Design a protein around this ligand. Structure first.
Ligand SMILES: CCCCCCCCCCCCCCCCCC(=O)OC[C@H](COP(=O)([O-])OCC(O)COP(=O)([O-])OC[C@@H](COC(=O)CCCCCCCCCCCCCCCCC)OC(=O)CCCCCCCCCCCCCCCCC)OC(=O)CCCCCCCCCCCCCCCCC
Ligand SMILES: CCCCCCCCCCCCCCCCCC(=O)OC[C@H](COP(=O)(O)OCCN)OC(=O)CCCCCCCCCCCCCCCCC
Ligand SMILES: CCCCCCCCCCCCCCCCCC(=O)OC[C@H](COP(=O)(O)OCCN)OC(=O)CCCCCCCCCCCCCCCCC
Ligand SMILES: CCCCCCCCCCCCCCCCCC(=O)OC[C@H](COP(=O)(O)OCCN)OC(=O)CCCCCCCCCCCCCCCCC
Ligand SMILES: CCCCCCCCCCCCCCCCCC(=O)OC[C@H](COP(=O)(O)OCCN)OC(=O)CCCCCCCCCCCCCCCCC
Ligand SMILES: CCCCCCCCCCCCCCCCCC(=O)OC[C@H](COP(=O)(O)OCCN)OC(=O)CCCCCCCCCCCCCCCCC
Ligand SMILES: CCCCCCCCCCCCCCCCCC(=O)OC[C@H](COP(=O)(O)OCCN)OC(=O)CCCCCCCCCCCCCCCCC
Ligand SMILES: CCCCCCCCCCCCO[C@@H]1O[C@H](CO)[C@@H](O[C@H]2O[C@H](CO)[C@@H](O)[C@H](O)[C@H]2O)[C@H](O)[C@H]1O
Ligand SMILES: CCCCCCCCCCCCO[C@@H]1O[C@H](CO)[C@@H](O[C@H]2O[C@H](CO)[C@@H](O)[C@H](O)[C@H]2O)[C@H](O)[C@H]1O
Ligand SMILES: CCCCCCCCCCCCO[C@@H]1O[C@H](CO)[C@@H](O[C@H]2O[C@H](CO)[C@@H](O)[C@H](O)[C@H]2O)[C@H](O)[C@H]1O
Ligand SMILES: CCCCCCCCCCCCO[C@@H]1O[C@H](CO)[C@@H](O[C@H]2O[C@H](CO)[C@@H](O)[C@H](O)[C@H]2O)[C@H](O)[C@H]1O
Ligand SMILES: CCCCCCCCCCCCO[C@@H]1O[C@H](CO)[C@@H](O[C@H]2O[C@H](CO)[C@@H](O)[C@H](O)[C@H]2O)[C@H](O)[C@H]1O
Ligand SMILES: Nc1nc2c(ncn2[C@@H]2O[C@H](COP(=O)(O)OP(=O)(O)OP(=O)(O)O)[C@@H](O)[C@H]2O)c(=O)[nH]1
Ligand SMILES: N=C(N)NC(=N)NCCc1ccc(I)c(Cl)c1
Ligand SMILES: [Mg+2]
Lengths: 98, 52, 51, 48, 140, 113, 55, 174, 347, 320
């Protein structure tokens, strides 16, 4: 494939590894989810624009709409985690081991 | 589709955007329109096992 | 099946509710004055703020 | 014995009892009528 | 795994035993590394060194089982002059199970492993001979 | 055959299940068992309580079951129709064999001693 | 020796002991999001590097 | 050199991703995501998507501003971590940069590269279309068709956004 | 939650699943999953406690990650085929990503860790939806893409799910975690037969949903969530202990009960393809499921556990819970075997 | 239409029926402190429903024909036996206390259901909020073990959290020596065995815990013995209360609907009073429970759901 696809596919993989390798802040990982959506938007937009798939031009817009619903949902849960524990640390969410 | 209510009801919910050779606004063609048209017509009706 | 790794596990609450943490969401403390346009220059208004 | 509180089901719910028997009769009549259609259609298509 | 598996089955029984032990040891080492990766990821070691100690202990144990099996089963085939007999994999399988008991210091695990590793290895040779399919291709 | 259709029109060339079908009777019996379980879990007299409710349990089971059996019978007719039509279209794949009698065919004898 | 020991030991007692040990390995987890998702990355990697599930 | 503009932007795109994937303080992760949003907008613009490029930049700028507010409230510590302040963060940062540097160095050396999958390296311009002279923006025509072809898309997205408001109210009402 | 709000959110859960099942376009399939994910989170948080907050957080992170992998697969498929039609994928890397994404959404091993924890952390009513209705959308997608699924990958996921589901349930005393590990095991049977006969996947799915709904409804009727609280049922509603016994035996696959039907038919379809080792291994491993089902029957119906004095106060009140469809579900859960040839309706 | 989400949607909302006179009043005090008489007068003057204190056989009074059942169907727990032998070896002291807490929990749900469904307030005599004073007194005299106290607290935590405290708490403060004289004049032989230290513990708990706790969330009227005699003066006190505090101000139709769905489902109300914690005082062997449960079903009108018992004149069973 063309060389741009190398860097966009690399960007998605970097964000995916970022998502799968948590640190402490839950917000750091929610950022990696938004990054994953950014790389999909760019990769989808390039393919659609290059091929002149006219009707598909709206598809990246729809992707962003549900990226925001995902982001808003992630922040709402972060608020409730923050209220319960005083931090958004993910190691506090271990009650359900038992 | 798992349940083909679109076919039974005769309503086009999403198959208008499934292929780049379907009708486009102001008849703008995709770059690979002819190739997609040729492959789609070759494989039509015979099933994936034969079409492959 | 008890094990050394699960020795510290306790049955969950009967009604699924864990007690609330006594963690302190501490308030921000601000020196409002004396050198401030609204403090009349000599009021050290020590304020505890939440937002 | 005689309840200190009137039971919720102390007396029949006649609106329900009527609907339940009415539905049973309707479904049975529909089923029988449908079956006769199928038998008649089946013989016609098969020249019987 | 596909390539390391072909190597083993592509070199006949009793011919080039050293090459056989390379393949089975390579399989065993890969299995031990996979076990270490999941173990280290799901039960965090107390320190980086302890994680390395646990990995090298599992990977060596797994490679030792693979080495003793691939060697013994080849030696049995060579000495007995019967390259098609499942019994060779039973002897190799049990020996691997015995080594597992050795690395674990537990005659009971050694005995149980010898039985089930031995039978499992014998079943593997039979399936190879007869063409038994584990992940059978859809046909009907 | 027809897309997302429970009973394609071609199914009407088949006879419907009889209302005395043994499978339909079993389905009706299941409706009866459902009625009894309904009484039992609500601590009502199991046999006697709410006969209208028990009737609807039987009738609704029979009603749905009749159409399932009608579709079940249809789908097995379609399976047979497809299989025989395929055999007609590919004779060379389904050759008619020459049959030999046991006087001609050699079978080994294994004594039980 | 045989009925009350060795015939018990070599089948029902050994089989059931293994199942108990396997159960504790499977279920003894820390309930930590970080560890479960770290295991997801390992699974995806070995799925490609070792088993070529992507080919 | 200008012919490689899309490739150069895509290199910065990845650098921003390494920025927030190494997970420093979310203040700096947000900055990394904003840089990637801008260059990502620059990349999509160079393929003829002016509206898509500007829109994704506009959306992520609003998003990261809300993330900034939530960071100061719910994801802060006394000593927020830059990339150089934490060994795990620094190791991820350098590892990502080195992998990117190597893929770039080799793909620009051979005018091609094989990093798992084969990528041509002749400059992204070679694949472009050659013959266009319409009196309209094709991307604009496709996007505008959302309201005449995408009735079904409008309904499900419209409903999802309404339910989203309902849902966040429920989730955050303890 | 306002009663009208609750109904609207439930209909959005169903609409999202239905969108996946009627869509011919990958984008609408992805939208359906997103809409479904959006509406289920408030159902998980409906009781607002730290365990429900943790459960919902773990669910969102897993589902949202899987959706990214799903959308990645769709975009790769678009690059290598130039179309969005829901069907076989045209790139093996796209097939791996979509298969892993659907396995994540299904909670199949080794992506299973969230199922026991999320189910434990939410109410029984929400767990019922999670372990039944939520399997429909990912299964309907697999039903359509299976020609391009890697056979070794899907059978590896199926085998690991049966082992881990069986082993994991042995160590549980909480009912919700027992149902979660049971669900993981049953998912393995569904996807093991998928490459061979997808019709048998639907039968297993339908029968599993009926039996799972029956169990959750009976647990809800008595408001029981532990083994020990379920052991008081004999001293309150004896009939319920018998229904629980019959369903648990059925779920274990014992003839002549319904739950034996899917295992029977799946073994048949696998042996027809000369798959002998795998169905034998699966059936023997499923004995672990039967073991910890049997333990429940011992403590629930076949013995009488100690009770408490305050239980006598319960004798004086009738069951008030809706128990919707329970009489029908339990009959279907147990008495369907004589009608097995009805599976052709699913063709 | 039985109350449910459908009734709520069609309009059955608590704020429609609830006025300024929809209050939950609790009357508390020591033994022989005059609670009963004061509670009855307050209810009659204010026009509220009166709930006589929940005793051993409270639950019988609400189900069946409302008459007390034999004592084996209350666990054989006896208040008389508690006075004769507070340190009984069969665990009667705590078993009685655990039974009484559950009876109060049930009565509180019934009071709340009446208040939310009709808007008429209610008057109680003690409640789940003040039941612990007896437990604390029992423990300080050594009548129960620390484990019994632990069990009581586990049950309370998971039950009392679901309800709202009373609007008004009325306390009649009668000093212990006066109470001892009052108990002495009453006459019943068993109650005469109460020791002053036991009654002082009830008083210490009432003032050391209950009242400081209730004050932060309820209106508290603390009367002496003489003030309490004239119920008219107490009613005047209640009529001019401001009601500026407590969790009732934060209630809305959405919340009271969830509360109504709980209190009308008595098995849900009593769910956690039988948690599987095996204290000898309250654990019943399987053979005993089975026998008693059979005998309970053989009582008139108890085999079947209310309204399906033909032995007691229920008709139309085949259509019900
Ligand atoms: C295309 C290329 C791929 C694309 C990515 C390119 C790179 C760009 C960056 C990507 C984002 C990286 C995100 C890193 C991250 O956030 O993790 C933080 C993670 C947790 O952060 P933390 O809270 O600060 O904990 C710090 C200490 O680790 C805390 O240590 P401790 O207190 O827990 O002490 C015990 C310690 C002991 O450690 C060990 O046991 C090591 C044993 C190893 C066996 C030899 O336990 C562990 O560390 C176990 C985890 C080790 C990792 C799993 C290895 C199995 O820390 C790390 O694991 C460091 C990793 C940083 C380098 C990442 C390299 C990425 C390569 C991934 C594979 C590529 C696949 C393709
Ligand atoms: C798709 C392809 C995937 C193939 C591999 C799938 C295996 C995934 C297993 C993940 C679920 C099971 C988790 C588990 O078993 O527990 C973690 C386990 C810890 O066990 P460990 O600490 O090593 O033993 C201690 C002895 N004192 O860690 C382990 O050692 C389990 C190793 C299993 C490797 C197989
Ligand atoms: C021709 C019919 C032949 C029978 C075929 C039976 C096939 C199995 C059907 C299972 C469904 C059984 C019905 C559901 C149970 C309802 C009965 C019950 O729960 O309690 C018994 C009850 C009497 O007790 P009571 O609650 O006080 O009600 C008074 C009513 N006079 O009610 C009664 O008075 C008696 C009602 C029947 C009792 C059923 C007992 C359950 C049997 C389960 C064993 C498994 C079945 C055998 C296995 C082979 C299946 C062919
Ligand atoms: C696969 C082969 C085997 C075939 C399997 C077929 C399974 C599907 C077949 C349907 C199974 C469910 C049948 C339920 C029968 C019992 C219904 C009943 O007796 O209801 C009585 C009464 C309500 O009756 P009502 O709704 O007013 O009737 C008028 C309808 N417009 O009110 C009551 O007291 C009923 C309370 C008990 C009901 C349990 C809760 C379910 C609610 C059902 C509502 C009404 C169902 C109507 C059924 C019609 C279906 C055709
Ligand atoms: C038809 C072809 C298909 C073949 C598949 C098999 C068909 C059968 C499917 C069974 C489905 C469940 C329905 C079984 C109905 C059970 C009826 C029953 O349990 O009797 C009612 C009675 C309830 O007691 P109660 O309401 O309080 O009345 C006063 C008596 N105490 O119950 C009790 O009092 C019992 C309390 C003590 C517990 C005893 C437990 C041992 C007896 C279990 C027998 C039922 C086993 C069913 C399992 C399948 C058997 C093959
Ligand atoms: C232990 C349980 C967990 C592990 C799973 C068990 C599987 C491993 C056992 C292997 C048994 C041998 C086997 O699998 O045979 C496969 C064979 C395939 O041959 P096929 O291709 O279908 O026919 C044409 C021949 N070229 O199959 C055939 O040809 C047909 C053989 C008939 C089916 C036999 C079923 C397997 C029986 C194995 C167990 C037998 C011992 C029972 C032990 C009871 C213990 C109390
Ligand atoms: C064929 C299988 C049909 C399965 C029928 C399921 C019946 C479940 C009914 C259980 C008893 C009644 C009940 O209340 O269910 C719980 C839940 C309502 O929630 P609840 O806690 O009761 O109160 C809500 C107020 N906030 O009720 C619900 O929300 C329904 C959740 C179940 C929906 C999925 C059922 C399985 C899939 C059905 C499609 C079949 C394929
Ligand atoms: C043809 C190729 C044949 C390949 C053969 C592959 C054999 C399978 C090897 C799997 C990996 C080894 O598996 C692992 O072994 C080590 C033994 O050190 C065991 O480890 C256990 O025994 C010893 C001592 O007790 C220590 O390692 C450790 O203290 C303890 O946990 C683990 O419980 C087991 O999970
Ligand atoms: C605890 C018990 C757990 C379950 C145990 C199940 C035992 C299953 C035994 C393995 C089944 C057969 O296993 C597999 O058979 C096929 C033949 O079809 C062989 O297939 C091989 O055949 C040819 C030659 O025959 C080789 O050149 C080639 O490398 C390979 O394709 C495999 O080398 C063998 O590994
Ligand atoms: C031979 C072909 C088929 C063989 C299949 C055999 C599978 C096993 C069947 C029995 C399963 C019983 O599973 C379990 O076994 C052990 C003993 O074995 C019992 O446990 C009992 O013996 C063990 C050890 O002897 C003791 O530690 C324990 O205190 C005692 O209760 C359990 O009560 C039972 O739950
Ligand atoms: C040929 C295939 C045969 C398939 C047979 C079906 C397998 C069914 C597996 C059941 C597994 C559970 O069986 C489990 O066995 C162990 C035996 O150690 C029992 O455990 C018992 O013995 C061990 C030690 O001996 C004690 O630590 C334990 O306190 C005791 O309860 C468990 O109580 C039982 O739960
Ligand atoms: C803050 C970090 C920033 C990181 C930015 C990363 C940038 C990535 C590297 C991009 C460099 C690409 O380098 C580009 O390669 C091509 C190779 O033909 C050169 O193009 C060349 O075309 C012909 C080839 O015959 C030559 O005559 C000409 O001299 C030369 O320009 C460009 O002049 C050069 O600019
Ligand atoms: N152990 C125990 N006894 C209780 C409890 N509530 C009441 N009693 C006893 O029940 C009897 C009646 O209590 P009181 O109402 O306070 O005494 P009284 O004679 O009716 O005087 P009044 O306050 O006017 O009603 C007393 O013997 C109490 O000790 C309780 O929660 N625990
Ligand atoms: N094995 C598959 N995957 N397909 C499949 N069901 N083949 C069998 C063909 C069949 C079976 C029953 C019927 I009714 C019909 Cl009409 C057709
Ligand atoms: Mg009194």
């Amino acid at each position: 494939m063309s060389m741009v696809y190398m860097n966009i596919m690399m960007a998605f993989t970097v964000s995916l590894v970022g998502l799968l390798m948590y640190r402490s802040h839950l917000m750091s990982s929610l950022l990696c989810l938004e990054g994953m959506m950014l790389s999909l938007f760019v990769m989808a937009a390039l393919t659609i624009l290059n091929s002149h798939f006219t009707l598909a031009s709206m598809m990246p817009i729809i992707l962003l709409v549900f990226a925001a619903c995902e982001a808003a949902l992630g922040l709402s849960l972060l608020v409730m985690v923050s209220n319960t524990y005083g931090t958004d640390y993910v190691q506090n969410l271990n009650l359900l081991q038992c | 589709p798992f349940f083909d209510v679109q076919k039974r009801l005769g309503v086009d919910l999403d198959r208008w955007m499934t292929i780049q050779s379907a009708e486009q606004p102001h008849k703008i063609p995709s770059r690979c329109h002819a190739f997609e048209k040729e492959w789609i017509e070759c494989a039509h009706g015979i099933g994936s096992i034969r079409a492959e | 099946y008890p094990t050394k790794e699960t020795a510290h596990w306790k049955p969950p609450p009967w009604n699924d509710v864990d007690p609330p943490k006594d963690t302190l969401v501490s308030n921000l403390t601000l020196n409002f004055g004396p050198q401030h346009p609204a403090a009349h220059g000599v009021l050290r208004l020590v304020m505890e703020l939440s937002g | 014995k005689f309840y200190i509180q009137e039971p919720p089901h102390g007396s029949p719910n006649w609106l329900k009892v009527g609907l339940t028997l009415g539905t049973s009769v309707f479904l049975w009549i529909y089923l029988i009528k449908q079956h006769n259609e199928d038998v008649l259609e089946y013989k016609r298509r098969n020249g019987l | 795994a596909k390539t390391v598996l072909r190597q083993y089955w592509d070199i006949p029984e009793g011919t080039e035993c050293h090459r056989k032990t390379y393949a089975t040891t390579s399989i065993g080492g890969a299995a031990g590394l996979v076990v270490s990766a999941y173990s280290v990821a799901l039960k965090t070691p107390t320190s980086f060194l302890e994680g390395v100690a646990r990995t090298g202990r599992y990977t060596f144990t797994a490679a030792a089982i693979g080495a003793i099996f691939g060697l013994t089963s080849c030696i049995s085939a060579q000495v007995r002059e019967k390259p098609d007999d499942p019994l060779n994999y039973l002897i190799g399988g049990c020996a691997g199970g015995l080594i597992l008991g050795a690395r674990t210091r537990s005659y009971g695990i050694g005995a149980a492993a010898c039985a089930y590793m031995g039978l499992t290895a014998a079943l593997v040779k039979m399936g190879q001979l007869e063409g038994w399919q584990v992940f059978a291709e859809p046909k009907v | 055959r027809a897309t997302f259709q429970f009973l394609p029109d071609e199914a009407r060339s088949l006879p419907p299940p009889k209302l005395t079908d043994p499978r339909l009777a079993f389905v009706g019996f299941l409706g009866y068992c459902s009625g009894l379980i309904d009484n039992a879990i609500r601590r009502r007299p199991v046999l006697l309580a709410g006969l209208h409710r028990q009737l609807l349990y039987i009738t609704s089971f029979v009603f749905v079951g009749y159409y399932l059996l009608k579709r079940q019978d249809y789908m097995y007719a379609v399976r047979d129709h497809d299989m025989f039509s395929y055999i007609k279209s590919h004779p060379e794949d389904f050759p008619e064999k020459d049959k030999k009698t046991y006087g001609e065919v050699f079978e080994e004898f294994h004594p039980v001693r | 020796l045989l009925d009350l020991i060795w015939l018990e030991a070599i089948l029902p007692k050994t089989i059931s002991l293994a199942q108990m040990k396997a159960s504790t390995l499977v279920t003894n987890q820390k309930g930590l999001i970080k560890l479960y998702f770290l295991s997801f990355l390992i699974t995806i990697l070995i799925s490609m590097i070792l088993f070529n599930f992507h080919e | 050199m200008m012919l490689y503009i899309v490739f150069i932007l895509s290199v910065i795109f990845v650098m921003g991703f390494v920025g927030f994937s190494s997970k420093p303080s979310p203040i700096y992760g947000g900055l990394g995501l904003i840089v990637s949003g801008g260059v990502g907008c620059g990349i999509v613009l160079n393929f003829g998507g002016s509206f898509l490029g500007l829109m994704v930049f506009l959306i992520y700028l609003g998003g990261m501003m809300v993330v900034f507010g939530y960071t100061t409230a719910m994801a802060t510590e006394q000593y927020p971590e830059i990339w150089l302040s934490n060994k795990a963060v620094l190791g991820a940062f350098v590892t990502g940069l080195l992998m990117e540097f190597f893929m770039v160095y080799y793909v620009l050396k051979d005018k091609e590269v094989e990093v798992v999958f084969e990528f041509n390296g002749l400059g992204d311009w070679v694949i472009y279309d050659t013959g266009d002279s319409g009196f309209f923006s094709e991307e604009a025509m496709g996007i505008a068709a959302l309201y005449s072809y995408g009735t079904w898309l409008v309904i499900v997205t419209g409903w999802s956004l309404l339910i989203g408001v309902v849902v966040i109210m429920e989730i955050t009402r303890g | 939650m306002n009663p009208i709000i609750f109904i609207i959110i439930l209909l959005t859960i169903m609409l999202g699943t239905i969108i996946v099942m009627i869509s011919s376009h990958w984008l609408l399939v992805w939208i359906g999953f997103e809409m479904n994910m959006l509406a289920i989170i408030p159902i998980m948080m409906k009781n607002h406690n730290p365990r429900a907050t943790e459960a919902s957080t773990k669910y969102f992170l897993t589902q949202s990650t899987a959706s990214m992998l799903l959308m990645m697969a769709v975009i790769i498929n678009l690059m290598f085929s130039g179309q969005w039609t829901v069907m076989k994928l045209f790139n093996p890397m796209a097939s791996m990503l979509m298969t892993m994404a659907l396995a994540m959404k299904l909670g199949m091993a080794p992506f299973h860790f969230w199922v026991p924890e999320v189910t434990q952390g939410i109410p029984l009513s929400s767990g019922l939806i999670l372990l039944t209705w939520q399997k429909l959308a990912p299964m309907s997608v697999l039903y359509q893409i299976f020609p391009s699924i890697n056979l070794n990958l899907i059978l590896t996921l199926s085998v690991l799910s049966i082992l881990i589901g069986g082993w994991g349930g042995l160590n549980q005393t909480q009912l919700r975690k027992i149902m979660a590990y049971s669900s993981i095991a049953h998912m393995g049977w569904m996807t093991a037969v998928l490459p061979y006969n997808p019709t048998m996947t639907l039968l297993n799915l339908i029968i599993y949903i009926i039996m799972t709904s029956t169990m959750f409804t009976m647990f809800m009727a008595n408001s029981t969530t532990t083994t020990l609280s379920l052991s008081h049922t004999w001293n309150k509603t004896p009939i319920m202990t018998v229904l629980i016994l019959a369903t648990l035996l059925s779920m274990g696959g014992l003839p002549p009960l319904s739950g034996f039907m899917p295992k029977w038919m799946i073994i048949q379809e696998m042996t027809k393809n000369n798959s002998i080792i795998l169905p034998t291994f699966m059936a023997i491993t499923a004995l672990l499921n039967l073991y910890f089902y049997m333990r429940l029957t011992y403590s629930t119906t076949l013995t009488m556990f100690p009770s408490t004095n305050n239980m006598k106060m319960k004798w004086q009140f009738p069951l008030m819970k809706k128990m919707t469809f329970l009489p029908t579900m339990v009959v279907l859960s147990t008495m369907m075997l004589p009608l097995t040839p009805m599976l052709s309706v699913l063709e | 239409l039985q109350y449910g989400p459908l009734a709520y949607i069609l309009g059955e909302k608590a704020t429609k029926k609830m006025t300024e006179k929809s209050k939950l009043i609790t009357v508390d005090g020591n033994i022989c402190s005059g609670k009963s008489k004061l509670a009855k007068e307050i209810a009659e003057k204010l026009g509220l429903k009166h709930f006589p204190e929940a005793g051993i056989h409270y639950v019988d009074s609400t189900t069946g024909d409302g008459k007390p059942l034999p004592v084996q169907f209350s666990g054989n727990c006896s208040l008389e036996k508690f006075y004769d032998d507070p340190k009984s070896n069969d665990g009667n002291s705590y078993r009685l206390q655990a039974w009484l807490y559950a009876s109060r929990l049930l009565q509180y749900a019934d009071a709340l259901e009446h208040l939310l469904s009709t808007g008429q307030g209610v008057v109680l005599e003690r409640s789940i909020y003040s039941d612990f004073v007896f437990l604390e007194a029992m423990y300080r005299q050594g009548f129960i073990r620390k484990q019994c106290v632990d069990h009581y607290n586990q049950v309370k935590k998971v039950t009392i959290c679901e309800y709202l405290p009373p609007h008004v708490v009325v306390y009649v403060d009668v000093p212990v020596p006066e109470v001892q004289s009052r108990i002495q004049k009453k006459g019943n032989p068993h109650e005469m065995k109460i020791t002053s230290a036991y009654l002082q513990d009830i008083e210490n708990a009432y003032k050391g815990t209950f009242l400081p706790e209730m004050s932060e969330k309820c209106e508290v009227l603390q009367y002496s013995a003489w003030e309490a005699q004239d119920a008219e003066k107490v009613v005047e006190d209640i009529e001019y209360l401001k009601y500026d505090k407590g969790p009732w101000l934060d209630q809305n139709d959405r919340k009271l609907h969830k509360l109504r769905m709980l209190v009308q489902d008595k098995l849900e109300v009593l769910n956690y009073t039988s948690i599987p914690v095996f204290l000898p005082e309250v654990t019943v062997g399987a053979h005993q429970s089975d026998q008693v449960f059979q005998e309970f079903t053989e009582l008139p009108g108890r085999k079947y759901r209310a309204g399906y018992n033909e032995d007691v004149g229920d008709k139309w069973i085949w259509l019900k």
